[PDB]
Coordinates of C-alpha atoms (C1' of nucleotides) and ligand atoms in Angstrom, one line a residue:
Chain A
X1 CA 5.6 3.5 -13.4
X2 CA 4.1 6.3 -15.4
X3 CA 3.9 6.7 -19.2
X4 CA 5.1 3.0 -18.8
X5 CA 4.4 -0.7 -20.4
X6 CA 3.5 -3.4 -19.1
X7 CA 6.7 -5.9 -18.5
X8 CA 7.6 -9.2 -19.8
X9 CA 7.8 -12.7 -18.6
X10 CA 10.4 -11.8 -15.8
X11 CA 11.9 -8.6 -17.1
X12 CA 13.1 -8.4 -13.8
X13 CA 13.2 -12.1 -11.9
X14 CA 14.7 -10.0 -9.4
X15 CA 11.7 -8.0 -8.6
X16 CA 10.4 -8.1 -4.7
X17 CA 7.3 -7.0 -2.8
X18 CA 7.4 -5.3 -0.3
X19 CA 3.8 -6.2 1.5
X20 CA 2.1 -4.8 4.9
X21 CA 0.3 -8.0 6.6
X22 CA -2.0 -5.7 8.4
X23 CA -4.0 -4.7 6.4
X24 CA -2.8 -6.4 3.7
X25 CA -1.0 -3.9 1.4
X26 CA 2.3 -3.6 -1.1
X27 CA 4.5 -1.0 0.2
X28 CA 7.2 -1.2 -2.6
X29 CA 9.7 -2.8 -4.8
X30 CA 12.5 -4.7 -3.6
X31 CA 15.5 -6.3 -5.6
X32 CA 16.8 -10.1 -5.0
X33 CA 20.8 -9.6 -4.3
X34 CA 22.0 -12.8 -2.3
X35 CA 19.3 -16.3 -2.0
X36 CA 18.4 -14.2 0.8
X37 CA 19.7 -10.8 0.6
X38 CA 17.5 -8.3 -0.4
X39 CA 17.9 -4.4 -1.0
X40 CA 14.8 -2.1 -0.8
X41 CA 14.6 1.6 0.2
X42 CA 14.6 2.9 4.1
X43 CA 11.9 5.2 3.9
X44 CA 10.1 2.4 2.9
X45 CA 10.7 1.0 5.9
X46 CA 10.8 4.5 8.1
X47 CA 9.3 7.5 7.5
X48 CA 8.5 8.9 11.0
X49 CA 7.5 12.3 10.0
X50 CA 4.5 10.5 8.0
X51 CA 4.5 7.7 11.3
X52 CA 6.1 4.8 8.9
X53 CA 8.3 2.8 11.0
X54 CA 7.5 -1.4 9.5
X55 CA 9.3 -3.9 11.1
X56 CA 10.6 -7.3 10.3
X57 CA 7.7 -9.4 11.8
X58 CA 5.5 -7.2 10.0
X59 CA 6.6 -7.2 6.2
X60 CA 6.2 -9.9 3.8
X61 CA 8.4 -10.5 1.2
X62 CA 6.8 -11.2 -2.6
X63 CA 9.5 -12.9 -4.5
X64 CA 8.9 -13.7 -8.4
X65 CA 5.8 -12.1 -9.7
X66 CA 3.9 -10.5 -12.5
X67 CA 0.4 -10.1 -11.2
X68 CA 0.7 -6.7 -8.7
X69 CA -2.8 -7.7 -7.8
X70 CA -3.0 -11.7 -7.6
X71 CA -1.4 -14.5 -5.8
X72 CA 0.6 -16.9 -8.7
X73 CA -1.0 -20.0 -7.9
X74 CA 3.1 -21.6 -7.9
X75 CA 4.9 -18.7 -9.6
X76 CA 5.3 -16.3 -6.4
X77 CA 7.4 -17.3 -3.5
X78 CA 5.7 -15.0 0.0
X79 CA 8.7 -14.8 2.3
X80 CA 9.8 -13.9 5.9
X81 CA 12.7 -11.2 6.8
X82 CA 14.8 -12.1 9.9
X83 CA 16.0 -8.8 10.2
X84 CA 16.0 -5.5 8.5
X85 CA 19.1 -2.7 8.9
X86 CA 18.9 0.8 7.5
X87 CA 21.8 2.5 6.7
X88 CA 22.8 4.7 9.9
X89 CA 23.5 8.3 8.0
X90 CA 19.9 8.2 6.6
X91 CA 18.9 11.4 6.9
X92 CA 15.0 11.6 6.8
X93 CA 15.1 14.7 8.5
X94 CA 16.4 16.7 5.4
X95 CA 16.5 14.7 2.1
X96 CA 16.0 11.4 2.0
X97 CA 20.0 11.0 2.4
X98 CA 21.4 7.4 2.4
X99 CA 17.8 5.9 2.4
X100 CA 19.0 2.5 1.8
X101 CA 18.0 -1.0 4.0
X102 CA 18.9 -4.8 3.7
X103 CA 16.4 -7.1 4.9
X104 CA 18.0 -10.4 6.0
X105 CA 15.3 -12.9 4.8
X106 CA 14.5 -15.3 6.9
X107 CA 16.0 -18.5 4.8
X108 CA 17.1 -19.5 1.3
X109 CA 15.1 -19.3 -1.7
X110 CA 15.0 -20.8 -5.2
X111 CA 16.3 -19.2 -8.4
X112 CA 13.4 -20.6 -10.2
X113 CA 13.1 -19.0 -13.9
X114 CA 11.1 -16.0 -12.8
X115 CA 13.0 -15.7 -9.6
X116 CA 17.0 -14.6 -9.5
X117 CA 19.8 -12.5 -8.3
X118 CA 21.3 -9.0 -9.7
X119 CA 24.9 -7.8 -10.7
X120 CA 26.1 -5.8 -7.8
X121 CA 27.9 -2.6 -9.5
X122 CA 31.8 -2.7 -9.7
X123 CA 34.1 0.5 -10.2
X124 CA 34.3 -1.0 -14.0
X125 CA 30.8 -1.2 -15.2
X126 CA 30.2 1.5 -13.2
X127 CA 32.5 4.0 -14.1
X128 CA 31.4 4.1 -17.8
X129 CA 28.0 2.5 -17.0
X130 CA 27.2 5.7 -15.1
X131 CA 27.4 8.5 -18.0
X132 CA 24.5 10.4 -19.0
X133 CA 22.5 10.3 -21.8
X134 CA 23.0 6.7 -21.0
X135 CA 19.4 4.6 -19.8
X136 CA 19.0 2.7 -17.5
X137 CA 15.2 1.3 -16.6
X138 CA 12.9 0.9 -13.3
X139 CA 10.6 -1.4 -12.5
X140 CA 7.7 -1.4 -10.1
X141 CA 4.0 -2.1 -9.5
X142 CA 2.7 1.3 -8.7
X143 CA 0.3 4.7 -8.8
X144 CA 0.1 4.9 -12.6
X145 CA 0.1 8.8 -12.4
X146 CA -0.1 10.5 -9.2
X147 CA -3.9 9.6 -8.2
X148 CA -6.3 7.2 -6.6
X155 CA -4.3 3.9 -10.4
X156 CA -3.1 0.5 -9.6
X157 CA -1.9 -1.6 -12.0
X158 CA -2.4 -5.0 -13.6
X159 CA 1.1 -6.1 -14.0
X160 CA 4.6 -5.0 -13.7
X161 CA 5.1 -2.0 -15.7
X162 CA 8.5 -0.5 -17.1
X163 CA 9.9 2.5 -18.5
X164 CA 13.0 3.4 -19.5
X165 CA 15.2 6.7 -19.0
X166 CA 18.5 8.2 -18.8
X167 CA 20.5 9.9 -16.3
X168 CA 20.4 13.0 -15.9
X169 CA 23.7 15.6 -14.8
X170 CA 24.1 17.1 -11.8
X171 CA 23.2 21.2 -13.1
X172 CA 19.7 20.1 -13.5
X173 CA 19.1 18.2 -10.8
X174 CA 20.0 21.0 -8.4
X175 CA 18.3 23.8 -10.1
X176 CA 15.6 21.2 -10.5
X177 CA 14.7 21.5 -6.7
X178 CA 14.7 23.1 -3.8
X179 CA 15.7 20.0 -1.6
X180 CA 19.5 19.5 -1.5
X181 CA 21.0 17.3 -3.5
X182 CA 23.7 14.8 -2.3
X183 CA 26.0 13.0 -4.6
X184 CA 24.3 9.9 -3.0
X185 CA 21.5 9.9 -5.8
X186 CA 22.0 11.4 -9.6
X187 CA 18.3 11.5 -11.7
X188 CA 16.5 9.9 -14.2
X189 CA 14.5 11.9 -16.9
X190 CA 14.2 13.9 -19.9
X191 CA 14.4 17.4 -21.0
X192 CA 11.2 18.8 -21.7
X193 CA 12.2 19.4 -25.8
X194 CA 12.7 15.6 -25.7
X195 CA 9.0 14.5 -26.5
X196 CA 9.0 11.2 -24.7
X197 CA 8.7 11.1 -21.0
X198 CA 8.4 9.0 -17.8
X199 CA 9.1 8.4 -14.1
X200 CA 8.4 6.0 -10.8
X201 CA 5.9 7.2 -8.5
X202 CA 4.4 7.0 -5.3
X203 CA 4.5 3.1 -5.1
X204 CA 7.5 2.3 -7.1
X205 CA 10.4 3.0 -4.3
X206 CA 13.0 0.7 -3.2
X207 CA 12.6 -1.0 -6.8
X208 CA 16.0 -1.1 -9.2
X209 CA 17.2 1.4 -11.5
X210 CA 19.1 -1.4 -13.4
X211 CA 21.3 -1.3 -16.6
X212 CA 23.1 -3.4 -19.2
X213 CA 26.6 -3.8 -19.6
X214 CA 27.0 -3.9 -23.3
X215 CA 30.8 -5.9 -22.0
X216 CA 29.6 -8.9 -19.7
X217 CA 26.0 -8.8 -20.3
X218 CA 24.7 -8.9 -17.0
X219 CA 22.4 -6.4 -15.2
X220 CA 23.4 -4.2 -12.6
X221 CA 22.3 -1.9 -9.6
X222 CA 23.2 1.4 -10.5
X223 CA 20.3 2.9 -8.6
X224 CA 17.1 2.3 -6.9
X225 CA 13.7 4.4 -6.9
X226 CA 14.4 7.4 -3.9
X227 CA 11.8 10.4 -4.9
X228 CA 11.0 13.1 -6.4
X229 CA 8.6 16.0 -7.0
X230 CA 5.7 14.5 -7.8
X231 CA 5.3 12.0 -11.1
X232 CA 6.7 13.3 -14.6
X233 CA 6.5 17.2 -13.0
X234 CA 7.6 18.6 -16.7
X235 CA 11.2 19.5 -16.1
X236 CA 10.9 17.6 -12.5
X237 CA 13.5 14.7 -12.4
X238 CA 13.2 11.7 -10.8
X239 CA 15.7 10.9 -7.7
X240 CA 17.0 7.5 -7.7
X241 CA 19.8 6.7 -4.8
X242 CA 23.8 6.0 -6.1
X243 CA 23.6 2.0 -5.7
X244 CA 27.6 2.4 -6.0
X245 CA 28.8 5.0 -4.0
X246 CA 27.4 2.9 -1.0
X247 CA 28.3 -0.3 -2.1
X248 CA 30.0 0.0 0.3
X249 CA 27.7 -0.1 3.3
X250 CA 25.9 -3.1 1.8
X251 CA 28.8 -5.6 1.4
X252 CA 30.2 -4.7 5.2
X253 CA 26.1 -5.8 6.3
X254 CA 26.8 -9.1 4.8
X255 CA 29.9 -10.2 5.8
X256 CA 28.9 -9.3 9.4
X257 CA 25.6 -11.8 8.8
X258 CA 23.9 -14.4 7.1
X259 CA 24.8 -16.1 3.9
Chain B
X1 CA 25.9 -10.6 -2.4
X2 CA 28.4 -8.2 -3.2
X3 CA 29.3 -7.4 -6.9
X4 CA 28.5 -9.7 -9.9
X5 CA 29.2 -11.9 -6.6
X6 CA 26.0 -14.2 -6.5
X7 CA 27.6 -16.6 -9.3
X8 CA 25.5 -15.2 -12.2
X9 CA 24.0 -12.1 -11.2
X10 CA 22.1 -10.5 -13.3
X11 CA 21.7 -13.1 -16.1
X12 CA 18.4 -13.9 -16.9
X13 CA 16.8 -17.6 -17.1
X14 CA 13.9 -17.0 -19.3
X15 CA 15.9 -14.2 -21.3
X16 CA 20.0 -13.8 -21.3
X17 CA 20.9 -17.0 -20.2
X18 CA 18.8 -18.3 -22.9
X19 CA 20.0 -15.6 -25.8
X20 CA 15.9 -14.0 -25.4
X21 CA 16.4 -10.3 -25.8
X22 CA 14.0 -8.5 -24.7
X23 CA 11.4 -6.2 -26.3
X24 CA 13.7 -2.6 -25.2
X25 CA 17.0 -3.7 -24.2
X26 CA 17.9 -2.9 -27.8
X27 CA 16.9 0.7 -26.5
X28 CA 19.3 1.0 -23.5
X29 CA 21.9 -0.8 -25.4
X30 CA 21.8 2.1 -27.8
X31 CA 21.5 4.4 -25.0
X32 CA 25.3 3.9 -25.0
X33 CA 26.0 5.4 -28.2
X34 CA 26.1 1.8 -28.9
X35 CA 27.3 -0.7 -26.8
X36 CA 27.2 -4.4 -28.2
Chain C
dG1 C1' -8.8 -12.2 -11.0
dG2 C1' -10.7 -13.2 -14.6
dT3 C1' -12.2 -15.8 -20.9
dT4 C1' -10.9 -23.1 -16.6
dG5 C1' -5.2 -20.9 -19.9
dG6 C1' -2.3 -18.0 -18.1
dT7 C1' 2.4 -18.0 -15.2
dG8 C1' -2.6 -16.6 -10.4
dT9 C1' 1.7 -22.9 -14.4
dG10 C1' -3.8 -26.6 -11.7
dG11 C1' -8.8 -28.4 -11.5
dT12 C1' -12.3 -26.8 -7.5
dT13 C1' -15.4 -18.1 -10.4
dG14 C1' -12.8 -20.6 -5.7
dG15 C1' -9.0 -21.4 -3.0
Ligands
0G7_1 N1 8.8 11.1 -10.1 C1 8.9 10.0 -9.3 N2 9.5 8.9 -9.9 N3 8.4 9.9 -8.1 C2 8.6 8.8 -7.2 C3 8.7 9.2 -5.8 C4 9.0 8.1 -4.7 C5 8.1 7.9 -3.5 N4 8.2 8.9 -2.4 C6 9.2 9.0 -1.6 O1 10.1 8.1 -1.7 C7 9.5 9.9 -0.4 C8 9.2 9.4 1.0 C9 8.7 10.5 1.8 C10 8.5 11.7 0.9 N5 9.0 11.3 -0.4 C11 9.0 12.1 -1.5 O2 9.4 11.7 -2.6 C12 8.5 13.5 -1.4 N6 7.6 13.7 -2.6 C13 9.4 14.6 -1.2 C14 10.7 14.4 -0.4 C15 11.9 14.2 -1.1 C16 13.1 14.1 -0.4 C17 13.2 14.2 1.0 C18 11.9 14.5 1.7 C19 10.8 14.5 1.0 C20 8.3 6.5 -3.1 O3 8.7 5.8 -4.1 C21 8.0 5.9 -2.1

DNA sequence: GGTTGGTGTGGTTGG
C-alpha cells in the first residue's frame, strides 16, 4: 500500500498469500470467505498477455500473517488449493473485466485469533454501504511506491469511493460497472492507493448497523500508484456475488 | 461462504469480538457521516 | 529476520 501504515495485530485475520513455490515468491493478497473458500483476483492467476497463467499445484496459500517477509514460527498456516475457477466473462483482453477467482483449498482450516472469515456483502449493507464519500480500507503486503520497495509488515490505508464521472474521464480504459474507485481528489491533501503487489486483497468496510466487515471490493488496477488525479480500480464484490455463491454450492464445503 | 454466511463473518477475535477498536476504524466509521 | 521477545508465540542468529 502506498502512503500507508503498518497494520495491527490482525487488522485483517482474513488476509491470504498468494505465494509462487517456484521460485519462491508472493503474488498477492487473498481474503478467507468459507474454512476453505478463498477469493483472490484472476489476473493474479492469468495474465497471458504478460505469460501469467499459475495453477493450483503451483500456488501456496499463506493464511494468518503479519510478517510479508518471515515465516510465523506457529502464527501462519501455508496451505494447498484443490482447485482454482476464474470467472468465465473475464475479459483480459480489454479491461480487466470480471477478474475475479475462487480457489477451492485443499481442506479446512482453523479460525485461530489471527486467522478468520469475512462478511460476504448483502443488498442491505450494501446498498447504503456503497455511497461515496464513504471509506472503505485495503490491505496488502506490497511495492511501497511503484519501484524496486517491499515491506516489513502488512500495511493499510484507508480511502473512499469514488463516483462514476471521474473514474471514466480518469482513463482511457473502459470502465465497467463491475468495479467503482477508491481515491481522493487532488484539493483533498491526504492521498493513497494499492499497487503492484496489493491485488486480489479486500477493499473491506464497516457496517456502522451489525458491526461486521464486508467485501465491497477487492484490489483490480489502476494507472500506476497515487497517479495525482489517477483512481484506484477495485472490482464490485457485490454485483458478482453472484457468480461466487453458484461456485460453492456446486463444490466443497 | 456466501453472505454474512460463515456464522460470524467478519467479526474479529482479537478486536470486535472482543470490543478492541481499532486504531482507524473510528475514521471509516465517520466516513459515513457517522454511522455508530 | 532480527534486539533470544515478538506473534517468525519457542529455545536451537538457526531452523
Ligand atoms: N493505484 C493502484 N492501486 N494500483 C494497483 C494496481 C494493481 C496491479 N495491476 C494489475 O492488477 C493489472 C494486471 C495487468 C495489468 N494491470 C494493471 O493494473 C495495468 N497497470 C493496466 C491495466 C488495467 C486494466 C486492464 C488492462 C491493463 C495488481 O494489483 C496486480
Amino acid at each position: 500500500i502506498v502512503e500507508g501504515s503498518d497494520a495491527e495485530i490482525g487488522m485483517s485475520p482474513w488476509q491470504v498469500m498468494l505465494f509462487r513455490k517456484s521460485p519462491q515468491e508472493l503474488l498477492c493478497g487473498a481474503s478467507l470467505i468459507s474454512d476453505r473458500w478463498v477469493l483472490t483476483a484472476a489476473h493474479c492467476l492469468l495474465y497471458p498477455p504478460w505469460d501469467k497463467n499459475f495453477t493450483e499445484n503451483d500456488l501456496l496459500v499463506r493464511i494468518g500473517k503479519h510478517s510479508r517477509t518471515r515465516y510465523e514460527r506457529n502464527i501462519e498456516k501455508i496451505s494447498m488449493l484443490e482447485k482454482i475457477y476464474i470467472h468465465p466473462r473475464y475479459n483480459w483482453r480489454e479491461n480487466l473485466d470480471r477478474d475475479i477467482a475462487l480457489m477451492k483449498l485443499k481442506k479446512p482450516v482453523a479460525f485461530s485469533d489471527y486467522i478468520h472469515p469475512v462478511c460476504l456483502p448483502d443488498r442491505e449493507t450494501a446498498a447504503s454501504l456503497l455511497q461515496a464519500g464513504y471509506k472503505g480500507r485495503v490491505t496488502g503486503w506490497g511495492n511501497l511506491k511503484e519501484t524496486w520497495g517491499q515491506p516489513s509488515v502488512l500495511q493499510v490505508v484507508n480511502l473512499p469511493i469514488v463516483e462514476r464521472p471521474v473514474c471514466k474521464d480518469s482513463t482511457r480504459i473502459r470502465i465497467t460497472d463491475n468495479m467503482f474507485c477508491a481515491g481522493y481528489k487532488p484539493d483533498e491533501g491526504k492521498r493513497g492507493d494499492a499497487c503492484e503487489g496489493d491485488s486480489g486483497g479486500p477493499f473491506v468496510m464497516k457496517s456502522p448497523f451489525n458491526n461486521r466487515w464486508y467485501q465491497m471490493g477487492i484490489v483490480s488496477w489502476g494507472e500506476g500508484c497515487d497517479r495525482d488525479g489517477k483512481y484506484g480500480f477495485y472490482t464490485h464484490v457485490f454485483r458478482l456475488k453472484k457468480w461466487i455463491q453458484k461456485v460453492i454450492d456446486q463444490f466443497g464445503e | 461462504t456466501f453472505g454474512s454466511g460463515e456464522a460470524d463473518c467478519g467479526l474479529r477475535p482479537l478486536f470486535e469480538k472482543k470490543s478492541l477498536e481499532d486504531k482507524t476504524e473510528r475514521e471509516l466509521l465517520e466516513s459515513y457521516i457517522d454511522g455508530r
